Design a protein around this ligand. Sequence first.
Ligand SMILES: CC(C)c1ccc2c(c1)[C@@H](NC[C@@H](O)[C@@H]1C[C@H](C)CCCCCCCCC(=O)N(C)[C@@H](C)C(=O)N1)CC(C)(C)O2
Length: 377
Amino acid sequence: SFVEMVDNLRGKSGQGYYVEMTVGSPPQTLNILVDTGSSNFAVGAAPHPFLHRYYQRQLSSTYRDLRKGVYVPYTQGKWEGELGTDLVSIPHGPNVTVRANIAAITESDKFFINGSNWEGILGLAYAEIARPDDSLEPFFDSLVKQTHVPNLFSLQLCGASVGGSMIIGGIDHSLYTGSLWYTPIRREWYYEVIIVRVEINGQDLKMDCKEYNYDKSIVDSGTTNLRLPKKVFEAAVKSIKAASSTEKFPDGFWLGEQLVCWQAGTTPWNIFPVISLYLMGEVTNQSFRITILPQQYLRPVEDVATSQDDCYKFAISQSSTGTVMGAVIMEGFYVVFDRARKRIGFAVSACHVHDEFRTAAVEGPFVTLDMEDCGYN
Ligand SMILES: CC(C)c1ccc2c(c1)[C@@H](NC[C@@H](O)[C@@H]1C[C@H](C)CCCCCCCCC(=O)N(C)[C@@H](C)C(=O)N1)CC(C)(C)O2
C-alpha cells in the first residue's frame, strides 16, 4: 500500500517539504514540515501572522496536557511551547493512528515562514536530541512502537512549486533506478554519516578526511543548503569559482545572499562543476559516491523584479557545527532511512535532476583505506 504515499509531500523552494497530518478528536488538519534534522513533533497552537490555522487544544476531546514546557533552538529560528499528547494520523500515509507527544507552539522567532502553507514540524531523528531531554519519545518511535509499521522510511524530495514522497514503513521501487548504496548511521542521534572523500569535477580536494566530518556530518531534510565546515567551504568555493571564472558574480553571491541571473534559458550550467561525496560503505575498505549537479546547489529563486530571467542563489554555505547534507543534496536521490539496520541508502531518484549532458549518480564500489580515521572525535 505504498502507492498511497507517493506524491504526499509539497513545498516551496527554500521552504522545506511538508506532509498532511491530523491532530486531535475530531481530527484537525495541519501541514507539517518533514525534518530529519530534529526530533520534536511540534505544531503552532496560538495565533501568528504567518499561520493560516493552528492546533486548538480546547477542541480535542483526546488532548492531555503534560504540565511541562519545552523550547527548541535550531541552527536558525526557535520556538517554545507546552508539551502534551494527542492522537495523530497521516491521511496519505499508513492507515493508522497513534498517541504521540506534541509541543503546542505558543511563541516563535524566525521559525514560521511568511506564506509557506505549513503550520508545524515533524522531527524524524532520534530521541538523543529531543527537547527537553531524550525521555520525550519522538513521533516515529511512537508510531513503530504502537503499530506494525516497520522501522524505516524513505524520502524522495523533488525539485522543480516542488513535490515529493515520504514512504513510511518501506521502500517504493517505482521511485528510483539502479542500485541502492548504503552507508552506516554512525551514531543514533542525528542521522550521522561519515564522508570519506570529496571530489570536484573529478579532482580530489586532498584534505584530511577528518575535515569533512568536523564535528559531524548529517542527513537533514530541514536544512536547505549543503553546509560545509570552514576549511572545507573555503576549498570548495575556491574550486567552484575557478571552474566558473568565465563569468563574474558578486562576492555577496558566494555568501548566499545575492542572486545571480541570466537570460531565460541561457544559464551556463556547463561552467559549474559537479561535486562527488564519497560515503563509507557496508563492507571493509569499501565506499560509494553520490554526484551533485549544479542544478542542485544553484537554488532557483523567484525573481519578482522581471519574471523574464532565470535567477538562482548559491546553496552551499559555511558552517561551524559540521557538514549538513541538506535538502538540495537529497533532492534527486531516493534516500532510505533504514533505522532497523542503522544505515542510510541512496539511489538515483525517479525525479532525478536533468542536465542534457551530465547526470546525478550513485556509483560503487570504491576502495578506500582507513575510512574509520575520517570520523571526528
Ligand atoms: C535538534 C535541533 C535543536 C538542532 C540543533 C542544531 C542543528 C540541527 C538541529 C540540525 N538540523 C537543523 C534543522 O532541524 C532546522 C529545522 C528548521 C528550523 C525547520 C523550519 C524551516 C524549514 C524550511 C527552511 C529551512 C532553512 C534552513 O536551512 N534552516 C532554518 C536551517 C539553518 C535549520 O536550522 N533547520 C543541523 C545542525 C547543524 C546539526 O544544527
